[PDB]
Coordinates of C-alpha atoms and ligand atoms in Angstrom, one line a residue:
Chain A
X65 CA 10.2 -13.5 14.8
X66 CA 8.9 -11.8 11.9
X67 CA 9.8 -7.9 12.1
X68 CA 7.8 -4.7 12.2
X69 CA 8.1 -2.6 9.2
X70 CA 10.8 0.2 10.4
X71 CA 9.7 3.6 9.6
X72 CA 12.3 3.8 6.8
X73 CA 10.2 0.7 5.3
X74 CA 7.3 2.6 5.9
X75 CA 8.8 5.8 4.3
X76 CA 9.1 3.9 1.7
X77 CA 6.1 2.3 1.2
X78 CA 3.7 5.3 2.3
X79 CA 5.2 6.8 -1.0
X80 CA 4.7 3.9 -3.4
X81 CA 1.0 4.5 -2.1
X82 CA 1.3 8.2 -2.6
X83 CA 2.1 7.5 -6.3
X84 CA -0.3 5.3 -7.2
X85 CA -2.5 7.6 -5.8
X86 CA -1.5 10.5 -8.3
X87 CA -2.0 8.1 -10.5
X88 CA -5.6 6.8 -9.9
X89 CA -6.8 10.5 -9.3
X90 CA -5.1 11.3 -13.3
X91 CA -7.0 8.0 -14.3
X92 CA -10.7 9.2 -12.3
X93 CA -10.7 12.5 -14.1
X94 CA -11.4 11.0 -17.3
X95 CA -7.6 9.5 -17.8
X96 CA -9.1 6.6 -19.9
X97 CA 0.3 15.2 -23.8
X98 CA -0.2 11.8 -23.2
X99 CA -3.1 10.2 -22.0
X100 CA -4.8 6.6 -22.9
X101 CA -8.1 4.7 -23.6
X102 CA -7.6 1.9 -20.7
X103 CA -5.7 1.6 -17.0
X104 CA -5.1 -1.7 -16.7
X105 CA -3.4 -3.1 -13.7
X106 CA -1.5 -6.7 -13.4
X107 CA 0.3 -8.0 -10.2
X108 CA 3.7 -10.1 -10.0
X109 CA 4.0 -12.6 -7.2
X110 CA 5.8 -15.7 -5.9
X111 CA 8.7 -16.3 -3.9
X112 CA 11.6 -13.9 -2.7
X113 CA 14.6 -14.4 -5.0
X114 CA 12.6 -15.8 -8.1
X115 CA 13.1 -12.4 -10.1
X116 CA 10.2 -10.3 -9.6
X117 CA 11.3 -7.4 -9.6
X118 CA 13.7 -7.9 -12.7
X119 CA 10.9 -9.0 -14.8
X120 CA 9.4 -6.2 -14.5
X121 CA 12.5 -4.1 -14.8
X122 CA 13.4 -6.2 -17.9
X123 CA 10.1 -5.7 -19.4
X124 CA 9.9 -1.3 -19.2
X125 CA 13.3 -0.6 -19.5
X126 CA 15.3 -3.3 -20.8
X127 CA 18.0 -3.7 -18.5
X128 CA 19.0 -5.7 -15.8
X129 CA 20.8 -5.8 -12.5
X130 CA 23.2 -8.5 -11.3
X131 CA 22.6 -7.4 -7.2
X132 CA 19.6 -8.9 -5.2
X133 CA 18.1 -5.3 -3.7
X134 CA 14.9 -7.7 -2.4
X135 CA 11.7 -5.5 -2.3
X136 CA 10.4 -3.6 0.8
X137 CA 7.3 -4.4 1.1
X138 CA 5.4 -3.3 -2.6
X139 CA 5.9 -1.2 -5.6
X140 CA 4.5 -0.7 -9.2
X141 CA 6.4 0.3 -12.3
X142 CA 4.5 1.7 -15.3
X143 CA 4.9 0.7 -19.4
X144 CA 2.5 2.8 -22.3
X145 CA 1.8 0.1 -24.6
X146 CA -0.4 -0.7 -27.5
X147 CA -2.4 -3.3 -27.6
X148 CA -4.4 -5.0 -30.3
X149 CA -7.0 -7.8 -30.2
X150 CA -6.9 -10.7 -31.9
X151 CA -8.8 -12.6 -34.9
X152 CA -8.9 -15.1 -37.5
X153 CA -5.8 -13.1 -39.0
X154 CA -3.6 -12.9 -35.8
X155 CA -3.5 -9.3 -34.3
X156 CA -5.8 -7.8 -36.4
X157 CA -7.8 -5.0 -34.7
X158 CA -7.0 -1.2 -34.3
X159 CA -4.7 -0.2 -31.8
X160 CA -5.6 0.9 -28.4
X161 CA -3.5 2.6 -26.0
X162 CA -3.3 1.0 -22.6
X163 CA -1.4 2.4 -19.5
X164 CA 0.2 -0.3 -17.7
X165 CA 0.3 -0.9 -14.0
X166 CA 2.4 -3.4 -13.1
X167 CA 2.2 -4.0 -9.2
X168 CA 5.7 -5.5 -8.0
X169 CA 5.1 -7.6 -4.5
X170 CA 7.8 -8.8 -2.1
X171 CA 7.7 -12.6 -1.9
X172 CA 8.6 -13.1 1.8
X173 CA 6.3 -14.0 4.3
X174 CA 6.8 -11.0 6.3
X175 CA 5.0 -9.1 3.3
X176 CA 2.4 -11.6 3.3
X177 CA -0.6 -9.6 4.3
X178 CA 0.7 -5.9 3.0
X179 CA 0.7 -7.5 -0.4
X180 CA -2.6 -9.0 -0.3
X181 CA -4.6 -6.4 0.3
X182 CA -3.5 -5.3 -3.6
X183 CA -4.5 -8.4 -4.7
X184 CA -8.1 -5.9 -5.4
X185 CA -6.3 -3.8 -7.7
X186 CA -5.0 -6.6 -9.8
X187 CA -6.8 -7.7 -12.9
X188 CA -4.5 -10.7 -13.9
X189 CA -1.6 -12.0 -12.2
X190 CA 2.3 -12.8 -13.2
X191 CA 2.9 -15.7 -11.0
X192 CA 6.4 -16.6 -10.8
X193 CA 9.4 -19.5 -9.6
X194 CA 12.8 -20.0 -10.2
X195 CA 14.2 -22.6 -12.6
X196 CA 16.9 -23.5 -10.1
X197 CA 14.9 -23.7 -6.8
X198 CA 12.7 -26.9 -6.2
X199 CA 11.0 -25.5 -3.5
X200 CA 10.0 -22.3 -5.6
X201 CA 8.2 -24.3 -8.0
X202 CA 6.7 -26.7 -5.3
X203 CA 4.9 -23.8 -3.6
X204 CA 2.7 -22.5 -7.4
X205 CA 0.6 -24.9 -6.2
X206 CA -0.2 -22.8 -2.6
X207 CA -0.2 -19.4 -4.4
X208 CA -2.3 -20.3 -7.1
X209 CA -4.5 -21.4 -4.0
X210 CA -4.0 -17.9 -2.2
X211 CA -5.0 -16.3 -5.3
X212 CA -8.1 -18.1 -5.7
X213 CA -9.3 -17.4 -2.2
X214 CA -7.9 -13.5 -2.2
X215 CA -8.7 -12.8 -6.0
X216 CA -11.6 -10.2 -6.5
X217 CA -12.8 -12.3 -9.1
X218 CA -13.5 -16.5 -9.1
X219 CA -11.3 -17.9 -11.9
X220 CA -8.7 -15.1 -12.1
X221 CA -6.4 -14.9 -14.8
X222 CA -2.9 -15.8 -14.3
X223 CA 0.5 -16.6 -16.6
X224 CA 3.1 -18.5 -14.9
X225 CA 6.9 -18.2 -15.7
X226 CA 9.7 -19.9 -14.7
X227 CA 11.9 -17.8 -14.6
X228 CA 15.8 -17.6 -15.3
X229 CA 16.1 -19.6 -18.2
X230 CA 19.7 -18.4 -18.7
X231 CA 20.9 -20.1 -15.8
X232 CA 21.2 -24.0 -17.7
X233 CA 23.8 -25.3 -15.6
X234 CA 21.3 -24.1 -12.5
X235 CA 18.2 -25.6 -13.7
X236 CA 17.2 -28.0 -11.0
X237 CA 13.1 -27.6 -12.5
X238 CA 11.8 -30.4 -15.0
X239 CA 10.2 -28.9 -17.9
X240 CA 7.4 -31.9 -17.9
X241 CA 6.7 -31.4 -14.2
X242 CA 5.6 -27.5 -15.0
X243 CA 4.4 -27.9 -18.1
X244 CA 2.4 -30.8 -16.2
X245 CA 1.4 -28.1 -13.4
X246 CA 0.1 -25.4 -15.6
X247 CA -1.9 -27.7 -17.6
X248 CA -3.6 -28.8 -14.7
X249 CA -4.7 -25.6 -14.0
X250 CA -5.7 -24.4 -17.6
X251 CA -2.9 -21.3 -17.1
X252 CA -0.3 -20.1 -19.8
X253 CA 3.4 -21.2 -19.5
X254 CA 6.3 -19.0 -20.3
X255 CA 10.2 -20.3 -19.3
X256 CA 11.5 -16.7 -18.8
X257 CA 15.3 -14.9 -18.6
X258 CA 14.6 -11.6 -16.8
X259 CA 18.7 -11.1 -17.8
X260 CA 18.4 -11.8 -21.6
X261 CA 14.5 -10.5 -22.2
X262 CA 13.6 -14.2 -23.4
X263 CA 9.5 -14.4 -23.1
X264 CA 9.6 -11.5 -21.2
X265 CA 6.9 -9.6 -23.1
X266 CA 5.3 -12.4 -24.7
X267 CA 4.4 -13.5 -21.5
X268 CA 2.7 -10.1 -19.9
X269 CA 1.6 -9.7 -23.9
X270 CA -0.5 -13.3 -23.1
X271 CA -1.9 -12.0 -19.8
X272 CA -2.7 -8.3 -21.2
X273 CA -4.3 -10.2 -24.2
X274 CA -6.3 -12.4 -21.2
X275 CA -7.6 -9.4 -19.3
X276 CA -8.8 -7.2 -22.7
X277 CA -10.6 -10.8 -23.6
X278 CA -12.4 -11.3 -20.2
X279 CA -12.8 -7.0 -20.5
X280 CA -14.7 -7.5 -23.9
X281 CA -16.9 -10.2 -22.8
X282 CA -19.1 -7.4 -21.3
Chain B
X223 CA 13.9 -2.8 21.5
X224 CA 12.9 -5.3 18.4
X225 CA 9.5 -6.3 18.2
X226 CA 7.6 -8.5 15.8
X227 CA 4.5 -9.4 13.4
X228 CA 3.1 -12.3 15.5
X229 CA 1.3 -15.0 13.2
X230 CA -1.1 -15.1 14.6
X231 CA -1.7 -10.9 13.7
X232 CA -0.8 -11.7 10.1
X233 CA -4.0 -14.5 10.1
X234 CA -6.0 -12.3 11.4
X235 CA -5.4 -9.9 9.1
X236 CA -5.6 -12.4 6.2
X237 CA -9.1 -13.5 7.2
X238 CA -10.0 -10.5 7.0
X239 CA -8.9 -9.9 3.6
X240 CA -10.5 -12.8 2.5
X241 CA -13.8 -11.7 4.0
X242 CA -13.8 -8.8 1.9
X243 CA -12.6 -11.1 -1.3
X244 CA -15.6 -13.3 -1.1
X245 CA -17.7 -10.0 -0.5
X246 CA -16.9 -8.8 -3.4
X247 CA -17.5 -11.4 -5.3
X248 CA -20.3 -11.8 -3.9
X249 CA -21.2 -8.4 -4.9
X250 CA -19.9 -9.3 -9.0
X251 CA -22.5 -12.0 -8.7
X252 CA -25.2 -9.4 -9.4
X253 CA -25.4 -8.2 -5.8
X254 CA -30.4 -8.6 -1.8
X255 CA -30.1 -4.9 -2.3
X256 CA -29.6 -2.2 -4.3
X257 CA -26.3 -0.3 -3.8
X258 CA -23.2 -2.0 -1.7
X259 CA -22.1 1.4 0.2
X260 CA -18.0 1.2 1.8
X261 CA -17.1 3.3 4.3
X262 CA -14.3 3.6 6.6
X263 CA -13.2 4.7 10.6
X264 CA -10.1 6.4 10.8
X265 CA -8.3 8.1 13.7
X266 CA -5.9 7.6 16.7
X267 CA -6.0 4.6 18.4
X268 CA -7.9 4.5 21.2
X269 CA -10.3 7.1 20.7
X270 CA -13.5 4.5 19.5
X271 CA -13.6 3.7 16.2
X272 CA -14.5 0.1 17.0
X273 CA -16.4 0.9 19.4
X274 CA -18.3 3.3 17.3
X275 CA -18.9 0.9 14.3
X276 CA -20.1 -1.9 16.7
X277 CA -23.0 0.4 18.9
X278 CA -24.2 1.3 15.5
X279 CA -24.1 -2.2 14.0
X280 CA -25.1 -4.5 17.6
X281 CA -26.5 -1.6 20.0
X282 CA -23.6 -2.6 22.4
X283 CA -20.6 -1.4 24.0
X284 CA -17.2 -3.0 25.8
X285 CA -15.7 -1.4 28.3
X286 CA -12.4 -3.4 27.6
X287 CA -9.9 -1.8 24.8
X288 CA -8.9 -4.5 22.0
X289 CA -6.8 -2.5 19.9
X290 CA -7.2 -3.4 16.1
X291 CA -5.0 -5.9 14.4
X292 CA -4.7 -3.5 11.3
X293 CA -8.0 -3.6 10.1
X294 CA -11.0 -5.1 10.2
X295 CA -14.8 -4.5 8.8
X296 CA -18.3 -4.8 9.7
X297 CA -21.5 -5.0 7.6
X298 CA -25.3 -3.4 7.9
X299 CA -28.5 -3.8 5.6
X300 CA -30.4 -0.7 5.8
X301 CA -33.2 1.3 4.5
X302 CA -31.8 4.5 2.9
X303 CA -34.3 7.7 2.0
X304 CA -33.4 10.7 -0.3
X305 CA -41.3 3.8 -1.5
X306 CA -38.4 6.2 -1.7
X307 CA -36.3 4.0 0.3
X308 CA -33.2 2.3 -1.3
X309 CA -31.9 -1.2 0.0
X310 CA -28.3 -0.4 0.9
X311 CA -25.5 -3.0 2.0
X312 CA -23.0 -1.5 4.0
X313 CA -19.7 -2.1 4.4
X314 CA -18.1 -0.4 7.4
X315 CA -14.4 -0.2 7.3
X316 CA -12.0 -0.6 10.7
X317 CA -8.7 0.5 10.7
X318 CA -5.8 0.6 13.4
X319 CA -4.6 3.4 15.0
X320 CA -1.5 3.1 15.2
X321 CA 1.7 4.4 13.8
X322 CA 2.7 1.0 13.0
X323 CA -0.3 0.0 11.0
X324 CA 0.1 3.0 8.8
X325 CA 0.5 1.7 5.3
X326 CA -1.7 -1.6 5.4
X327 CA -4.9 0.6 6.9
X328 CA -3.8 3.5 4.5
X329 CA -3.6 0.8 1.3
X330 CA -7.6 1.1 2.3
X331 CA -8.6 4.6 1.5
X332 CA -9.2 4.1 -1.7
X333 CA -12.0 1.2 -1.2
X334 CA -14.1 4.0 0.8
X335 CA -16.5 6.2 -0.6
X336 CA -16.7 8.3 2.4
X337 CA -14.8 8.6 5.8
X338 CA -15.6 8.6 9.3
X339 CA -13.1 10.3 11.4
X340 CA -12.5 10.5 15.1
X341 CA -11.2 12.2 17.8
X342 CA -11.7 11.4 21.1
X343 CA -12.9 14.8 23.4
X344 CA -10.9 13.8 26.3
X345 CA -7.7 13.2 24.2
X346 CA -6.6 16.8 23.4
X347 CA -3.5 15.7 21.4
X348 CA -6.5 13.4 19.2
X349 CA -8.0 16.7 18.2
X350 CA -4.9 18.6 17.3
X351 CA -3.8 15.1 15.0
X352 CA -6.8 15.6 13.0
X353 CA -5.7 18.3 10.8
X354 CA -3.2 15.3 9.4
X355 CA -5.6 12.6 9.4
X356 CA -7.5 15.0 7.0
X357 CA -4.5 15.6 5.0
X358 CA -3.8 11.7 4.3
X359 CA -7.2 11.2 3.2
X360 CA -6.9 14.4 0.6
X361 CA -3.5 12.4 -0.5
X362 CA -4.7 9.0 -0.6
X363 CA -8.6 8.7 -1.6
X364 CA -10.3 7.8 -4.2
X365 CA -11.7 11.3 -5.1
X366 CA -10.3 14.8 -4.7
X367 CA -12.6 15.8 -1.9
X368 CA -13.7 13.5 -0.4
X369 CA -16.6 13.2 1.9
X370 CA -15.9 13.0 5.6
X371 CA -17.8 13.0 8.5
X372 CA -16.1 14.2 11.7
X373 CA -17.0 12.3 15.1
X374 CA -16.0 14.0 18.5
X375 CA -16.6 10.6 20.7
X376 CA -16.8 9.9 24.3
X377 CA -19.5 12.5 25.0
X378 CA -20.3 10.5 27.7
X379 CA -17.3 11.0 29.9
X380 CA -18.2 14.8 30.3
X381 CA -16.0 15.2 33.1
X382 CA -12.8 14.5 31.3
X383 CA -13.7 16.5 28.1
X384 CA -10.6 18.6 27.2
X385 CA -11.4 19.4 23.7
X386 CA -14.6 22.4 23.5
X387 CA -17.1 22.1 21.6
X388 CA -16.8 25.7 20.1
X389 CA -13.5 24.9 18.9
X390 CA -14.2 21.7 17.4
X391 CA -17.3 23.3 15.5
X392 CA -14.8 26.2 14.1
X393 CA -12.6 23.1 13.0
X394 CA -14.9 21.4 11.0
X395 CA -16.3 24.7 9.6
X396 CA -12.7 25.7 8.3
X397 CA -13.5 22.2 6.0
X398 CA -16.7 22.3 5.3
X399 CA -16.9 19.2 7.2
X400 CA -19.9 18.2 9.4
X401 CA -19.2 17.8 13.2
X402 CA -21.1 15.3 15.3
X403 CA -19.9 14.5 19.4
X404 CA -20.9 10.7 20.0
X405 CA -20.8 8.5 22.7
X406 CA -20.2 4.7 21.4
X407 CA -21.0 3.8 24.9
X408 CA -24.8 5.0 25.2
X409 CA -25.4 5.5 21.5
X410 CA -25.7 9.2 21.4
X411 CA -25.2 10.7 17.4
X412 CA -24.0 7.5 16.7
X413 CA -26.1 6.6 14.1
X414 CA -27.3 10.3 13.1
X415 CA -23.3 10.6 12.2
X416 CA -23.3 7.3 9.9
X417 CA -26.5 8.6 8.1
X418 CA -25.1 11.8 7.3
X419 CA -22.0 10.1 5.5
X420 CA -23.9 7.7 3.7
X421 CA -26.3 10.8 2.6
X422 CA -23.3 12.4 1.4
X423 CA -22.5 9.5 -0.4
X424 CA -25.4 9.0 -2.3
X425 CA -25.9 12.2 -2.6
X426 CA -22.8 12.4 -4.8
X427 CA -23.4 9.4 -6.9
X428 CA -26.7 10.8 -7.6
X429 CA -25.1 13.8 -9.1
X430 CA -24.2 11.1 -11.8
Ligands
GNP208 N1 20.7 -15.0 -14.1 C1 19.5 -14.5 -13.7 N2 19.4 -13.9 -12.6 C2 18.2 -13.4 -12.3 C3 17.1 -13.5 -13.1 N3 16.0 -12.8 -12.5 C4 16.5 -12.4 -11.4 N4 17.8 -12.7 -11.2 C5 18.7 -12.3 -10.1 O1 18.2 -13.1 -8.9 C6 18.2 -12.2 -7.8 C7 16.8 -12.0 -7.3 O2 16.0 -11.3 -8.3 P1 14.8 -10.2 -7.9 O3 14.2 -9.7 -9.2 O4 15.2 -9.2 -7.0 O5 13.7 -11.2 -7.2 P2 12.3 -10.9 -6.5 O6 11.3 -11.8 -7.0 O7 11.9 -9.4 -6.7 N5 12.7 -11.0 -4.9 P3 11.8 -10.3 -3.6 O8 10.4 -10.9 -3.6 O9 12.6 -10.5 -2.3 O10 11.7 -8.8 -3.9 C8 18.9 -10.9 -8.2 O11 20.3 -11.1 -7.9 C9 18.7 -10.9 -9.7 O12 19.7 -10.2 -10.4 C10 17.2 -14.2 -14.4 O13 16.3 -14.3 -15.2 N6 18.5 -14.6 -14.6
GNP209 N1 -16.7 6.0 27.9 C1 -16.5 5.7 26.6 N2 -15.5 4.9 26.3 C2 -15.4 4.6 25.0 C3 -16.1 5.2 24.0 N3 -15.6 4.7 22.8 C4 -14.7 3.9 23.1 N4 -14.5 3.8 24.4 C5 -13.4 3.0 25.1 O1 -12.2 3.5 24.8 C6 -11.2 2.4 24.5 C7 -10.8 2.5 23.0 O2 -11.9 2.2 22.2 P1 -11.7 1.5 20.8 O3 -13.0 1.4 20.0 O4 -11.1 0.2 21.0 O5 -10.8 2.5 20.1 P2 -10.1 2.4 18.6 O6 -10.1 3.8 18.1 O7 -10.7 1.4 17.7 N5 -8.5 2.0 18.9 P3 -7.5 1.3 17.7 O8 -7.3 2.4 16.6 O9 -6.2 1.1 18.5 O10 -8.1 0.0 17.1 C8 -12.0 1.2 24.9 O11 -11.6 0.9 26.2 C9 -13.4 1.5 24.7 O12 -14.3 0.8 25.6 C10 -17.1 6.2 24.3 O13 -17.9 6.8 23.5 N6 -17.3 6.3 25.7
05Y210 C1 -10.6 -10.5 -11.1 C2 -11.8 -9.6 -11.4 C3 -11.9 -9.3 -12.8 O1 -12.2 -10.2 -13.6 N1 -11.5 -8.0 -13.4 C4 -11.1 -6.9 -12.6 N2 -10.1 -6.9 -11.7 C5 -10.0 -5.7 -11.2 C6 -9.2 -5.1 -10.2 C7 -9.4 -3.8 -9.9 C8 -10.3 -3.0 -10.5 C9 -11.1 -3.5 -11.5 C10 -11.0 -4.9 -11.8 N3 -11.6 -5.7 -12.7 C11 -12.7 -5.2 -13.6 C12 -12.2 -4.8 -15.0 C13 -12.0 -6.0 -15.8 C14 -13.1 -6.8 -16.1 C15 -12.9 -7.9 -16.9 C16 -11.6 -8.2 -17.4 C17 -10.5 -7.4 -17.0 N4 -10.7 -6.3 -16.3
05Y211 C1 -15.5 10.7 -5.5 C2 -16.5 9.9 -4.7 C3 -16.0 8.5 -4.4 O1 -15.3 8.3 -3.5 N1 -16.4 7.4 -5.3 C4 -16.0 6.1 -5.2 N2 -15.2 5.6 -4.2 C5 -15.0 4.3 -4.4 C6 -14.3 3.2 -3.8 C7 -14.3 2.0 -4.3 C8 -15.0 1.7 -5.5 C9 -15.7 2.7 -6.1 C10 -15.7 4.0 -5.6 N3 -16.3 5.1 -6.0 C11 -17.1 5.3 -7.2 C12 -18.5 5.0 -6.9 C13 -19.1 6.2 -6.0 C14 -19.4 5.9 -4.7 C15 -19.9 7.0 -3.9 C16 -20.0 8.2 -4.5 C17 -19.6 8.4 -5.8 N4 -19.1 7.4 -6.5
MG212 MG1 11.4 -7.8 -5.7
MG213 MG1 -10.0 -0.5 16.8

C-alpha cells in the first residue's frame, strides 16, 4: 500500500524542481560576484536510514543532526569547491572552480521511480549503507544493478561508503566482506561518520576527481 | 480516502525510464541519423496527448481512454527540410495529466527542446488551464522561452466544441505561440503541428 505523494509532499518537491531550475537556467547562460568554470552534478543513494542526507549535510556545512527527518521524495544541496587534477606530484594542476550539485534521494521504495528519473542528471554517484544494518549492505549489490541499467552512461562512476563509522559498538558490517564487494566491482571504498566528518570529503573528493578524469578524456 | 502507488504503476514507470537510459546511451554511442530531436505533450488529462502522439507515429486512433501511468515516450525517424533533408530521431515525450503526476512528468521539462501543448475544444475549463501549463514550462524548461506549439484537439467532435476558434487564436497571439486545432482521431493538423515544433527547434539550434 504504498502512498500517493500528498500535495504537501508535492509542495515540496515542485520547489526542489523550481530551484534547480534557477539554477540550470544561471548555468545555460554561460554560468560555466561569483560564478565558476564547471557544474558538475553527483547523486547520493541507498537505503532509507543509511545517512544520506547527513552526508551531504556533513560535507557543506559541517554539522550534523541527531533526529531522523527522512527525505520527501528529493533534494540537492550545493558546495563551491576547487578542484585540482592530479599528476606525478599529487595535486598538481591549477585550480578550477566547480559548482557542486549534490542531488539527495529518498531511499524508500515509495520514491523509487521519482528518484530515478534524476539518475540523467547525475554524473557520478555516492552509493551508500549503514555499518550497523546487514540488510543495507546486502542490497549494494541490487543498486549497483539499478544504476547500471538507469545510468545515462555504461560503466558509471560510483564511490561506496559505509557509513557511520562512529557507531563501533553498532557495527554489525565486516570490513572484508565490503572491502570484498567493492573490489569486485572495481569502485572506491570509503568507511564514513556523517557525525564526526571522517572520509566525508575524501570520499566525494575521490568521485569529483573520477568525473573531471572521465571529463578530460574528451 | 487513502489511495496508493500500485506496483505495478511504479514498473511501468521504471520501464520506461530505462527505455530512455538505453536511448541515450545509445545515442552517446555516436548516434542512424543526424540529430536525436526530444519533445514533449503536456496538458490536462484527457484531452489527447496520447492520442495525438500515437496518430502521428502509427496513423491510428483508440476510442478507449488509458490514462497515462506518469509518463511515457514514443519514437519517429524522419526526414527533416530547412539533399537538404536532415535524418532526425525523434523522441516524443508523454506525460500524465493529472494533478497527482505533477512532479515526476514536471522532473521532464527539462529533457525537451520544445513543447507540445493541449487543450481539448470541448473541455472549456482545458482552455482556461492553459495560461498555467504555459507558466510551468517558463518556470521549469531548459531555456528561457521556450518553443511551444499549441494544439486545440478534438476538431472532430464539432458539435461539442465549447472553446472558439477566435478566442483561441487571440490566446496564442498574446504568446507569440503558434495555434493549430487537431483531431488525433482522423489525423487532421496532426502532423502539420509536430513539424512546426520541430522547425522551431532546429531552427533555434541553427542560430548556433
Ligand atoms: N551516529 C551516526 N548517526 C548517523 C550517521 N548518519 C546518519 N545518522 C543518523 O541516522 C538517521 C538517518 O540519517 P539520514 O541522513 O536522515 O538518512 P537518509 O539516508 O537520508 N534516509 P532517507 O533515505 O529516508 O532520507 C538520523 O537520525 C541521523 O542522525 C552517522 O554517520 N553516525
Ligand atoms: N473524438 C476524439 N476523441 C479523442 C481525440 N483525442 C483523444 N480522444 C479521446 O479522448 C480520450 C482521452 O484521450 P487520451 O489521449 O488518452 O488523453 P490524454 O491527454 O493522454 N490523457 P492523460 O493525460 O490522462 O494521459 C480517449 O478516450 C481518446 O480516445 C480526438 O481528437 N477526437
Ligand atoms: C554517465 C554519463 C557520463 O559519463 N557523464 C555525464 N553524466 C551526465 C549527466 C547529466 C548531464 C551530463 C552528463 N555527463 C556528461 C559530462 C561528463 C562527461 C564525462 C565525465 C563527466 N561528466
Ligand atoms: C533553449 C533551446 C533548448 O531547449 N535547448 C535544449 N533543450 C535540451 C534538452 C535536453 C538536452 C539538451 C537540450 N538543449 C540544447 C540543444 C538544443 C536543442 C534544440 C534547440 C537548441 N538547443
Ligand atoms: Mg534523506
Ligand atoms: Mg496519456
Amino acid at each position: 500500500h504504498m502512498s500517493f505523494l500528498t500535495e504537501e509532499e508535492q509542495e515540496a518537491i515542485m520547489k526542489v524542481l523550481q530551484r534547480d531550475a534557477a539554477l540550470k537556467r544561471a548555468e545555460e547562460e554561460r554560468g560555466s560576484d561569483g560564478d565558476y568554470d564547471y557544474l558538475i552534478k553527483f547523486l547520493a543513494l541507498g537505503d532509507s536510514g543509511v545517512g544520506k542526507t547527513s552526508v551531504l549535510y556533513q560535507y557543506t556545512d559541517g554539522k550534523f543532526n541527531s533526529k531522523f527527518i527522512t527525505t520527501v521524495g528529493i533534494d540537492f544541496r550545493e558546495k563551491r569547491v576547487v578542484y585540482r587534477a592530479s599528476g606525478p606530484d599529487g595535486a598538481t594542476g591549477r585550480g578550477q572552480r566547480i559548482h557542486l550539485q549534490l542531488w539527495d534521494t529518498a531511499g524508500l521504495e515509495r520514491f523509487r521511480s521519482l528518484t530515478t528519473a534524476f539518475f540523467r542528471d547525475a554524473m557520478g554517484f555516492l552509493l551508500l549503507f549503514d555499518l550497523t544494518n546487514e540488510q543495507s549492505f546486502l542490497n549494494v549489490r541490487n543498486w549497483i544493478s539499478q544504476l547500471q541499467m538507469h545510468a545515462y552512461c555504461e560503466n558509471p562512476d560510483i564511490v561506496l561508503c559505509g557509513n557511520k563509522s562512529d557507531l563501533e559498538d553498532q557495527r554489525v558490517v565486516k570490513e572484508e566482506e565490503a572491502i570484498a564487494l567493492a573490489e569486485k566491482y572495481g569502485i572506491p571504498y570509503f568507511e564514513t561518520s556523517a557525525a564526526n566528518g571522517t572520509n566525508i570529503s575524501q570520499a566525494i573528493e575521490m568521485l569529483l576527481d573520477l568525473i573531471m578524469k572521465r571529463m578530460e578524456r574528451s
